[PDB]
Amino acid sequence: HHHHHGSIMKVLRKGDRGDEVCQLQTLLNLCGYDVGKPDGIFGNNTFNQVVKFQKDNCLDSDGIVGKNTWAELFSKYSPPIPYKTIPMPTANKSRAAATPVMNAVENATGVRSQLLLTFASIESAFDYEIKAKTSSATGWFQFLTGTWKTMIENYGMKYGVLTDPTGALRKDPRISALMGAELIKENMNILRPVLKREPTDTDLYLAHFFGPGAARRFLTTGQNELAATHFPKEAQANPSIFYNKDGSPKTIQEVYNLMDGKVAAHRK
Ligand SMILES: CC(=O)N[C@@H]1[C@@H](O)[C@H](O[C@@H]2O[C@H](CO)[C@@H](O[C@@H]3O[C@H](CO)[C@@H](O[C@@H]4O[C@H](CO)[C@@H](O)[C@H](O)[C@H]4NC(C)=O)[C@H](O)[C@H]3NC(C)=O)[C@H](O)[C@H]2NC(C)=O)[C@@H](CO)O[C@H]1O
Ligand code: NI
Numbered sequence: 001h002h003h004h005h006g007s008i009m010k011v012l013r014k015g016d017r018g019d020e021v022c023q024l025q026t027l028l029n030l031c032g033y034d035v036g037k038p039d040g041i042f043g044n045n046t047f048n049q050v051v052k053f054q055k056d057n058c059l060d061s062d063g064i065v066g067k068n069t070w071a072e073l074f075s076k077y078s079p080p081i082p083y084k085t086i087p088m089p090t091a092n093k094s095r096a097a098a099t100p101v102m103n104a105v106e107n108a109t110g111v112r113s114q115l116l117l118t119f120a121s122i123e124s125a126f127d128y129e130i131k132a133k134t135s136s137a138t139g140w141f142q143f144l145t146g147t148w149k150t151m152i153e154n155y156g157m158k159y160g161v162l163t164d165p166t167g168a169l170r171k172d173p174r175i176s177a178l179m180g181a182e183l184i185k186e187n188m189n190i191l192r193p194v195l196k197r198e199p200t201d202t203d204l205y206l207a208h209f210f211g212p213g214a215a216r217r218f219l220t221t222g223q224n225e226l227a228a229t230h231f232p233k234e235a236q237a238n239p240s241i242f243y244n245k246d247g248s249p250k251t252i253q254e255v256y257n258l259m260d261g262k263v264a265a266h267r268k
Contacts, residue, residue: 005163006070013064016042019154024065027157028053030077079160081108086174093127098140101177109181114268115201116177119184119208121266128173139170141180141208151179158182187212194220201267202260209259210234223253 010020017040025038025046033049047063054061057072086104089097098120102113123142124130131138136145143151145167152164159178161169169175187207191199194216199207207215214231221230228235228242228249235242235249241258244250250258 002071002074002162003067005074006067006072009065009067009070011064011066012042014042014044014047021046023154023157024050024073027073027077030080030157031073032076074162077157079157081158082160083174083178084160086178089128089173092129092173093125095121095126098126098128098173098177101173105177105181109178109185111181111184115184115204116180118201118263118266119180119205120177122205122263128176129171136167138167140173140176141170141183143167143170143176143179147183148179151183155179155182183208187215190216191219202256202263205263206259218252218255221252223251223256225252226250227252227255 010016012020012024019040021042022038022040024042025035025040028035028046028049029038031053033053035046035049050065050069051061051063053059053072054063054069057076059068059072086108087101089101091097095117098117099113102116102120105111105116106113120126120128120140123137124140126140128140130142132142136148137143138145138148148164148167148170152161152169155178156162156164159175161175164170184204187204188199190212191203191207195203203215203219206218209215210218210231214234218227218231221227226249230252231242241255242250
């Protein structure tokens with residue numbers, strides 16, 4: 001039930017801090033119990049609201065959030081942007097069919113449709129049902145199974161999606177775009193501070209493909225430097241882009257231009 005999901009949630013209590021407290025705080029708000037802006041610190045305000053929430057619902061009201069309380073939150077919260085508001089595309093594997101979808105996600109998330117259209121194009125040639133034969137990667141945004149979960153747990157409620165054990169929602173174009181936009185926003189906030197410029201589609205794609213931490217180090221690591229030297233992991237994992245045909249290591253500049261090149265093929 002919602003009980004099994006609440007069952008795997010972290011058992012919280014006053015004093016705790018992190019993503020869980022933040023999710024707790026948000027659900028509280030979305031349930032009518034305001035605890036102010038979600039800051040990730042389980043303090044007094046959150047504690048009181050929890051107790052009161054537990055009392056209003058006949059739950060062991062000691063202030064501790066366990067299976068039953070999580071279950072009650074997933075049941076009473078009201079999504080501020082239910083995903084059904086985002087239309088399904090009238091066809092899979094179709095750029096023209098995904099546009100209206102991306103336009104809706106732009107209005108809902110802020111992220112520009114063109115950027116969304118590019119990503120979907122470079123990741124699944126618009127097949128929102130595709131599953132990479134090489135890894136977890138699935139759907140329009142080729143979400144891995146891991147990051148998808150973390151994405152669904154911190155933003156799902158925002159669009160009315162609590163759990164997705166199978167991670168099967170990645171096959172849903174709507175929720176894929178929504179989560180895609182949220183990931184892009186996360187990443188465009190990590191980058192602008194370091195890149196004295198608005199992160200570009202390629203900057204952003206680099207974070208999407210290699211992760212933000214690495215993209216960060218990379219977008220700031222000396223043009224003529226030997227990438228493989230600074231990104232052994234990625235180089236080993238994607239030698240085709242980090243190594244020349246003869247096996248010599250490419251420079252940072254070359255790798256960048258190759259990537260920008262791959263992105264350049266799915267733009268407007
Ligand atoms: C070998 C190969 O080519 N495989 C491809 C996959 O790698 C690729 O999937 C993407 O893979 C990267 C790295 O494996 C992965 O990166 C993770 O990204 C998340 C979020 O961007 C990072 O977590 C964030 O970290 C910051 C701090 O740096 C936090 O502030 C933020 O809150 C965190 N948010 C989340 C979501 O947790 C991870 O640190 C980072 N991990 C690593 C090791 O770098 C991407 O998430 C994967 N992208 C997707 C869409 O799944 C896949 C798709 O492009 O294609 C494969 O072929
Ligand atoms: Ni409980």
